[PDB]
Each structure stands twice: as C-alpha cells, then as structure tokens.
Write a protein that binds this DNA or RNA. Structure first.
Length: 271
RNA sequence: AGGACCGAACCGACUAAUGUUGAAAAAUUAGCGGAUGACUUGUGGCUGGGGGUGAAAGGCCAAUCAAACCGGGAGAUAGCU
RNA sequence: GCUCGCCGGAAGACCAAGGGUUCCUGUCCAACGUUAAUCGGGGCAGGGUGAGUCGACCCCUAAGGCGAGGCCGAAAGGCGUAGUCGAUGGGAAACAGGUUAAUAUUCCUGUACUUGGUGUUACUGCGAAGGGGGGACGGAGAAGGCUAUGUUGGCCGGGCGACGGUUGUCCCGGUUUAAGCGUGUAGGCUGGUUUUCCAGGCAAAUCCGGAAAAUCAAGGCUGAGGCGUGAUGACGAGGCACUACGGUGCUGAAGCAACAAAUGCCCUGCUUCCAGGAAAAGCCUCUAAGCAUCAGGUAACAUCAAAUCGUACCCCAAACCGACACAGGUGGUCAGGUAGAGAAUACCAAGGCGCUUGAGAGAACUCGGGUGAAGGAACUAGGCAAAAUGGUGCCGUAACUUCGGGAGAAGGCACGCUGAUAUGUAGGUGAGGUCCCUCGCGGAUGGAGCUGAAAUCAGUCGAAGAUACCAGCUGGCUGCAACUGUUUAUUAAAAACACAGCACUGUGCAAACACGAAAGUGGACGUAUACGGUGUGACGCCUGCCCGGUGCCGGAAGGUUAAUU
RNA sequence: AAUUCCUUGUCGGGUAAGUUCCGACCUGCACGAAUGGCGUAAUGAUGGCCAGGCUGUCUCCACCCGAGACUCAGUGAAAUU
RNA sequence: CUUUAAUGUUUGAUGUUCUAACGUUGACCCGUAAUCCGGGUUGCGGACAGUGUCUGGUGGGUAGUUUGACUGGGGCGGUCU
C-alpha cells in the first residue's frame, strides 16, 4: 500500500512510501542473478554521454524471462520479489519440470496462482500467447515487437496495452503513450497489466532519495557561463534567447524522429 | 525511525589577532560549522587540451587555466620602448 | 648520576606506503648541525637483515588494461571475441619462552600444525575445459552470553620508618604461563530418514531441483568462552658462587578467588528497514567421453620435499611529500590508573622527551595573557574583540505552527562533607550445602560472600559545594532562501548552485540524445508510472490579458525556387 | 521594496535626539503572477534593527606575569644603492 | 501532308503486387567448450531504407575576421569632397 510518513524531521514531511508486504523478506534466487556494474553515464571512451547518472546503491541483475518460450507447461507462483533494476516487481515461478524463473508481476498475481504459456493457454492474467489467439479489445503487457526476441513494450510499473484490431499477420495496438502501433500477429504478449500502479504515487521527499537511485544533480544552464551552454550567463537572470539544448536544439517542440525506416506501423502517433 | 539533536576523532574553514624577506610560496592560536550521511577515507583504475570534469565559481586539470605543460614551426610580427 | 618539568587516545609502541644502510660498533671534527662540540641521521672503516607456517611470488578474479583471428578506419591506429593480465578482495599451515652491541613467530629450547611427492599394506568405481552446491557478502538497531583488561581481597616475600604516630584493618612488590589436541557449553540454523517417479540443470547423471508416498521425531551442521591437557616444564620477586660492579652458571617462595568489564569475540548471527546489498577459484559433490585381473581413488604407517625474493632502520617523523634537521601534510593496529557519561578534559603509569644558540638586564613599543575604582556600548561603519552564559535532577515553559516542533524556550529551586536509616539499603553477582536428573560445562533450591547506587533525615565547615580543567548568552521585530547540503584549493560560504516537488516538450526501442570520420559504446541488459532536455524550485491560496513579431508544431490553392535535361 | 531618481517621501511607533529599522498611506521615476506572484511554521557560522545581562569597547587608561626589543659572547642574512 | 482511334514498339508519372539486390542490434545450427565476427537454413521488411557524388535550405553548433579618423583627454553629438 501507500503510506504517508510523519514530519519528525525536515525530509520526512512529503516522503511517501509504497509498502507491499507481499514482497519476500529474504534473499532472492541466486542461480538467476548476475552482476550489474554501474557506469556513470560513461562509455568505452570514458566520456560522459548521458548526464545525471552516478553513485547509487549496489545492485544485482535479475534474469527475467520476457520471451516466455516454455509452452504447454504450467507454472505456479512461489513469491513476489523486489527488483531494483526496474520499476515493477517480479514473481518467482516454479515449472512442473523442476525449473524456476523470474517474470514481471501482473496486476493481481499472488503466491500459488497457476499460469501457462503457448497457444493453448488459458485467457486469464499471467498467461502468455501470441497476439494471433488473443481476443480483440483485451489488455496485455510485455508485448513482443519481433517474434522470438522477447517482450519490449509495457514493462514498467502499471503499463498496459489494449489490442484494438487485427487485420492480417499484423495486429494494431494502442500503447500507453496514445500511439497506435501495429505488430506482427505472432509476437507473444502476456495477459493483464503490470501491478505496481501505486508506484507513481510515490514521493522521494528529499535530495538524498534521488542519489540512492543513482541520479546526480541537474544544473540548469541559465547560470552556466555561456562558454558552457547557449543560455550561459548574463548580469542577473536574463535568458533572452529561445530555449535550446546544449549543442543547439530547441527542446520545446522540435520533433527529432529522424528514422524514416519503419514509418508504417505508426498510424496515430499521438496528438 | 531520522540527509534528527548535543558533542570528540575525522572532514571542513565563519570571525579575530599574529605572521606578511613569515615556522609556512595561504599557516598558527582562541573560538566556529557538519559529525549514520547528498558522509568521510586508503589502494588501484578511467575520462586529455578547444578537450576533459564541473551540486556551475569561468572553478579544477601536478604551487601555472577565458583554453595545461614540453619540444618544434621560430631569430613569429612588433609603424612601439 | 641525584632532582625539576613536559606528552601520556601521545610528543608512547608495532607496521604499510615511501625512502633505501639513516641500524650497531670503533675512530675522526676540516665542511654539514642556523652557536661550541669530545656528540651526531656528518666523514672513514668494519660488521649487521637467517623463515615449509609472517609478506610477496603462486592459485581465482572485480573495476579496468592488452588483445590471436575478427569488424572498422587515408596511414598511424581504434573497438573488441576467445583468451591473457590486473588487489585495494577470496585461497593450506606456529605458539610461548630465551638469546645478539645490532636480526628473529625467521636462530636455539620445548611443544605443534599444513599441503604435496614416493613407497608399503588393506579396501575399492576412477575420470571434465562440463552440471549442481558452497564460497557469497547491505545499512541501522537491540539486548544477552564471554574474554582481553582492571580493582580489591587472599597468599608468598621484604620492610617497621630522616619529623609527631606507625607489629597493624599498616606500607612496597609479585601473584605470569601460549599455539595445539580433547571436551563441544551459552546460544544460532534446519524437521530428518528410506523407497518410487520426472517435459528441467545445452548430453548424461547415484548429485541439484521437483512430485507422489512410507516411517520416526530426535538428526545433523555451526558455535565465543570455559574446563583438562600442553605444564614433574618454562617464566618468576629474590638469593647462593664468580662478581673487570660489564655481567654469567646454580637455586628460586606464592603463582588463587571474587567483583567489574569493553568500541573486541560468539555475530557473515538475531530483529527490522528500503536505497534491496561483487565476481571467480580453491574445497564438497555429480556424472559423460574414456580406463577396469590396470590406471586411479580411500584409510593407516613410513619417508621425502616445501624452493626463490623481502626481513636491517625511520615510518604523524630530523630518515616520506614540503628547496631546510621547515610550528605544515601523511593510511591502518595496540588503547593502562584516578575522577568522568566518554577515545573529551585534568593529573599520573609503562615508556619516551625537554623541541641545536646561551648568559644577564627588567626602558619605550609590539606580541600572548591576568586583575581593576565609579560608570556600563557613551566605543565603533557595526557590541569587531573581550567579558559573560556554561553541568545534573525537579518544577516550569509564550506568540505561532505544516501539530512534528517551537523548547535546553524563558524562569526558578536543590547540589559539598560526615553520620544514621542500612556495622553497605535498593538492586546486581552468586559459592558451599541440600533436592532432582536424559548421572552433564546439567536443573531446582540455597543464599554465604563480593559489588553497589539513588534518596530522606539530622548535623557540620567554608566568602563561595556542578567549587579546578571541561562546560549553551538569552529574548523581541524583520528581509532573503524552504530545509540537510554544495561553491570560487590561495582576499567572496552567500539572498548564488543543488534539492525533493510542479509543468512544458522530445523519445515506440536499431528510442531520442551523446562520445565517436566508422565500427561500436553509453543511454539500458532499461521500454512511456521509462529515459533525455529545459525552466521553476518544499508546502499553502493561485498563476490573469495578448500569437503582431521571433521560434516551434501543422496545412494547402497558387506564386517563387537548386542540381539535372 | 534586495526594485523609489526627486528622498532623510508623509504619518505613527521605538529613542532626550532614529538618513537605518518596524507598521501603515501610494504620487509603483523603473513590482507583478512558473526568467514565477503573495504568504509561510522550522532551519541559517546569512543581512538589518531594538532590548535584558556582561564587560577596559570607551570616558581614561593604571599595574603586574611572561616572549621579543636592550647589553655581553658565538654564528651571521636581506630588499636597496 | 491538314484528321484519330483498339493496336505494336518507345519511354514518362502514380498505384497494387512480387522477390532475387540490400537491410535484420529476429529465431535455429556450425566453425566453437565464444551474446564478437563469418558462413549456412528459415522468417520478417524490400527496391523503401541506408551509403556515395552533385545540389538548394537551415546552420554562432564551430572556426577565421572586421567593427574609420579628426577631436582643446576619450566617448556621445558634429564634421570628412
């Protein structure tokens, strides 16, 4: 649930936690773990490519199965777990053959719910089938963009896709951004919505709370000595120029989609 | 429980005096601030000059930075001393 | 050598980094030492560093580096796979005592341990560049149970007092002993055992995991410390003979208990929280391909080997970085006594120093300090500075408020010593004995003894009782910023920068964007409740009119318009 | 007003006397609503102001303890010219 | 030769479809005890994308430069034949 703390100190007035006792109070399944090194926004060249990244708490990577290629084998949920590498939570499932794996947590999954993947799977949350067999107007998540590679859409806290039509080997989708995209009619998509919806209602409350996540402070630019930014300086707060990124781009309306490759699955991009 | 309180280590450096060919090419003395955290620290590693890094001051990059240092073009040019 | 003074959570001791003979002895004083110098971290010469167990090397790896082929790139070269390097990490084994002018857990004495090689004997399913397990890990907090260590007492030994008293409840001193082996406790974790089956662990698998059954509840793992052994020993205050008063052989009494008690150990535990907490090998297992009267494997004894390099000395400093024998800077470990909440502070122990110019005088003036008549901020840009406040317990505590705070608000009272309550209370600790028992490091009871507050009452001394060091000035109005924080190393710590929060916009993933001639990488092993950019800057009530201009997002009818022809 | 030139705006408060400060007035030279507007408890080595206490800050300095200055011996600089 | 239609050949524009170039930071196998790369099978896109040359637009993102003289100091103003 969501709980609002008390103002016992400056830094706890506006803090709002998202407590979920369903999560496991113990160590996760190690066989499915893998080191995850922090970069700091730097690349092989050692230069900062993405700013506002650095520090944070150590993390271990949870190997999640977005493909769900184990068809015709039921799996029961053992326990929910906290995943720092992502917003949503995961669920450790056990397959009848003796296999254990991680998956994203749908809206109302618990410990003991049974699920199955494939074409003959049941139409209920948690199960995975290609969008060819899914009905129209339903709600799914962890959608695949190309058959066989794994889910890439609707992977966040409370994201969900709504199948609106199916013409042929393609199927139309309305993503959480309002974009009306269509994908092949064989990409595997899980039923239901990812359940952490109360995550957006969270409030960090203090600065150090953002540093734990690994986000470094953001310096605006208006007070940045124009040698370092177009906005630069000025005697006071002048800012008598158009809003502009570094390297000279608008940042307040300029569309920067320069792909021109697909331009076919896009139908009602947005607006 | 706490970017919580008082306060040593530790990290800092608000005030004053001294010193200013100083003990010291920025310190000492008396007080001062933070002191479980956006903390501090050791070792090793990475980012290289119109580039880096920067909680951003045009600050820092080996006592040197509105474009480091070394060598070279080079005996630059100097209607000025 | 006898005194004085200083540090004593260091101005002591052991190391690393670093330096690289400064270590010890003898000799010398030209130069070096901010003076002299017989002295020296100086000159000269000689000697000095002993390891199967400490450390490195070695084995395994992180970040990251190099990188066969390979991709990319005018050349140079860049990125990078398999792989190979890379500790600040993980990985087998030694303690005590004694000894040298200078080294030792390295030598000697005594007692031990570990990993390997070979052989012998007995019993046998061995094998991986593979699978699994383990290794393997956060922060905060809470007690409990122990020890290091200390205090007192007891014991042994010595002493009877430079000046009143001191054969006693007196004074001084000592009362130490390891690794290892055995016992396997406080307490922590886990339900075990056997059979059957199985879409999984790239193939297999007696191992792992899963599933269905049967049978029992006691099974196992871990685990400080203590006890015994080690130890009929060593050490040992002091003596017996030599005694160049430099020191060696021999001998050498007591060698216990109780209380207190860590920041260390049990604890990589337990509980709890969100920011959700390295990898790999060794080690334990599983088998495949293969080898089976072999080879291998297991157990016991015997035997062999464990090399190589480092080891001196300084190491908060005169030996490192600072041009100096420079009020500087430099990481980890050990952490005594009294008072104390305390690693603060004061005085001391062990131990180590008195800071490489001194003597004398006692003027102005300067520096660092103390005291002060009456007045008390009149000083001054300004209460700069200084003075003052300063602790514990009880009572008590405002406007306002986001109901948390404000607040230690303000303000006021009592604080010493002795005696009694109580020959030392409350409480803590806990022996003997007794009872019981799964006869054990047991349980119950027992309460000796040790330790020990706090308080009331009464009395008493002093000018002053939180007496010293240590140790908040307070209150009111108001601007700015919400706050904690960050910033101009070296004149600016702030109303600036950040900040959580809000909004706009971009981004559908081979994402946008960014570093890159490109490959490719980051963004992200993320997927719109996400990432990037921008402005604003908690919260509270709100955020109004204008799209002409600039820019951005869209559009059509026409006009205009490049290369090309 | 961190914004007000004329300006020490005017009134009132505090003071024996207040160009600053606080509270109102509005004639806003030249505030203004996310280059945010008006408020805001708490916080601040932050800026301004008024009090209590406290004092050598001062009226107005006096004395004293120490280190230099001064004399003797030894060693023996410096900018400048 | 004044004249136009179904044709044939010619090329031009749009649209639908296809696959063989090309793309694949999709899946499966081998080299190979390797998430590189390469080859191979298949699938999805598909003559679009993307690259090269030419070309228009945008372009302080980044460079190289300019920004007069007289002047009762200079600047502002004014002047320059």
């Amino acid at each position: 649930a969501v709980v609002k703390c008390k103002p016992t100190s400056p830094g706890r007035r506006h803090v709002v936690k998202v407590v979920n006792p369903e999560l496991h109070k113990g160590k996760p399944f190690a066989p499915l773990l893998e080191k995850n090194s922090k970069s700091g926004g730097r690349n092989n060249n050692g230069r900062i490519t993405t700013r506002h990244i650095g520090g944070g708490h150590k993390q271990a990577y949870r190997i999640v199965d977005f493909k769900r290629n184990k068809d015709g084998i039921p799996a029961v949920v053992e326990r929910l777990e906290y995943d720092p590498n992502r917003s949503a939570n995961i669920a450790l499932v056990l397959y009848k053959d003796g296999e254990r794996r991680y998956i994203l947590a749908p809206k109302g999954l618990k410990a003991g719910d049974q699920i199955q993947s494939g074409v003959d799977a049941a139409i209920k949350p948690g199960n995975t089938l290609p969008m060819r067999n899914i009905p129209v107007g339903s709600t799914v998540h962890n959608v695949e963009m190309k058959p066989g590679k794994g889910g890439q859409l609707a992977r966040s806290a409370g994201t969900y896709v709504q199948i609106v039509a199916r013409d042929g080997a393609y199927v139309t989708l309305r993503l959480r951004s309002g974009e009306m995209r269509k994908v092949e009619a064989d990409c595997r998509a899980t039923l239901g919505e990812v359940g952490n919806a109360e995550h957006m209602l969270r409030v960090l409350g203090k600065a150090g709370a953002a540093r734990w996540r690994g986000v470094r402070p953001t310096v605006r630019g208006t007070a940045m000595n124009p040698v370092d930014h177009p906005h630069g300086g000025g005697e006071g707060r002048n800012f008598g120029k158009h809003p502009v990124t570094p390297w000279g781009v608008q940042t307040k309306g300029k569309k920067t989609r320069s792909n021109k490759r697909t331009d076919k699955f896009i139908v009602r991009r947005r607006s």
